[PDB]
Paper text:
The APCDD1 ECD consists of two closely apposed β-barrel domains (ABD1 and ABD2). ABD2 contains a large hydrophobic pocket that accommodates a bound lipid. Collectively, the results of this study suggest that APCDD1 serves as a negative feedback regulator of WNT signaling by neutralizing WNT ligands.
To determine the three-dimensional structure of the ECD of mouse APCDD1 (referred to hereafter simply as “APCDD1”), we produced this domain as a glycosylated secreted protein using human embryonic kidney (HEK293) cells, crystallized it, and collected X-ray diffraction data to 1.95 Å and 2.15 Å resolution from two crystal forms. Attempts to use molecular replacement for structure determination failed because of a lack of discernable homology to known structures and the low quality of predicted structures. Therefore, we produced, purified, and crystallized a fusion protein between engineered maltose-binding protein (eMBP) and APCDD1, collected X-ray diffraction data to 2.3 Å resolution, and used molecular replacement with eMBP to obtain phase information. ABD1 and ABD2 have, respectively, three and two intradomain disulfide bonds, a large area of interfacial contact, and one interdomain disulfide bond (Cys52–Cys466). This structure is observed in all three crystal forms (eight unique APCDD1 structures), with a global rmsd of 0.7 to 1.1 Å among structures. In particular, Gate-1 side chains show a concerted inward shift within the ABD1 pocket and, together with multiple other side chains in ABD1, largely occupy the interior of the superimposed ABD2 pocket. A comparison between the bound and unbound APCDD1 structures shows no major conformational change upon lipid binding.
Residue numbers in the entry: 50 to 388, 392 to 405, 409 to 473
Amino acid sequence: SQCHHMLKHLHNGARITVQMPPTIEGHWVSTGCEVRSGPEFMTRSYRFYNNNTFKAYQFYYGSNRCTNPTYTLIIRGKIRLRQASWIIRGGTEADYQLHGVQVICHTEAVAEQLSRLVNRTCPGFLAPGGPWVQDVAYDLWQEESNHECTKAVNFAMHELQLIRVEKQYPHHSLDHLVEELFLGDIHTDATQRVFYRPSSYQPPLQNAKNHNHACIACRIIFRSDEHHPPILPPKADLTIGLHGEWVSQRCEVRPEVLFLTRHFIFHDNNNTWEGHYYHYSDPVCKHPTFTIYARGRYSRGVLSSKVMGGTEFVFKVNHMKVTPMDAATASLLNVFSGNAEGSWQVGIQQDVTGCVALGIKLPHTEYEIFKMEQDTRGRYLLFNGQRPSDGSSPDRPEKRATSYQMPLVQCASSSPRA
Ligand SMILES: *[C@@H]1O[C@H](CO)[C@@H](O)[C@H](O)[C@H]1NC(C)=O
Ligand SMILES: *[C@@H]1O[C@H](CO)[C@@H](O)[C@H](O)[C@H]1NC(C)=O
Ligand SMILES: *[C@@H]1O[C@H](CO)[C@@H](O)[C@H](O)[C@H]1NC(C)=O
């Protein structure tokens, strides 16, 4: 359980095989309570049938534990896989056609809030007698009626345009095949969701036939429908305890920056942090491009009022070092090094932090959102804020994320257990 060991052997040393071309035929489910920008607390139950049609459930909830359903969307349509993405290596592009979007409200309060929101968004949309009632499917989109108000709920289905299926086995075992469907990332800005071409992935869905055996949420969701939405178990909220070391569980994908792993170190004795960002050109993180080392200070935590389960931090970067890891990276940095002798070299670390290179601004302050959970094995998971989809920095409080990146796993600690 050394940090270096877990970075050498991502996802507990699991061997990953990529279905190329991808086979999406089957039932795929969320592995927990997902957070989309907003925030939206939701689970997915997506069925892709052999005739290339799909029925997708999006179950929405009022909290980060997904114990109290609010409304469910039932999204019907047809999907056709095109070819391997040239932008996202390991990704496969696809085209889709919506046949229908229906909404069911699971409480009176939601029926009345949602009907009001549909009316404010699309004044000419609602029927005469009064507000919507619970447990009734209302049309938000019909393929043969010409009307629609999906903008009310900030709906779009562009996630179906980028597809990756990973097959996962334990390092030395042919028992426990886990199949994961990666669909396109959801834009962090709701308004931009209608025009966004995914360049990264949502958290993976797991196949109802080949899911991790410890995935409780998987089993609950598989037995659900629009009139019985998945009720997830109420896990207790953990308090943020940063002290120690955290590493990526996977070859991560960020919008516009592609593949990377992270190694973070937190010192709670003086609120100082270090980040290593190992950047790669490939989706199994074997071919390095450049490494960023960053160091600075963080604030005390304040529980978020915007995002149930989240803790607000301010993070300041005071120091930065860059290591080009291939000749192309060193070449690009040398071409864009003015007065003098930046002398960038493969594998040689240089401090950027009296002047700065590449017009990098230091110090740099970010407004962060963190949560801590446990995996099925009782290992601690650290989530920080989803990176803005447009490549921008959360550099003002109002630009703080309302959703999370994929989690880091703790690899060093000085906290007890008994
Ligand atoms: C596609 O297949 C499913 C069977 O799982 C069926 O319910 C659905 O109606 C079929 N679609 C069409 C257009 O025939
Ligand atoms: C619907 O929205 C419009 C615009 O805000 C408002 O003027 C109207 O009164 C609303 N309708 C109802 C029935 O509340
Ligand atoms: C903070 O504490 C860590 C761990 O002892 C130490 O390495 C680091 O130098 C300290 N930094 C400052 C600025 O005091």
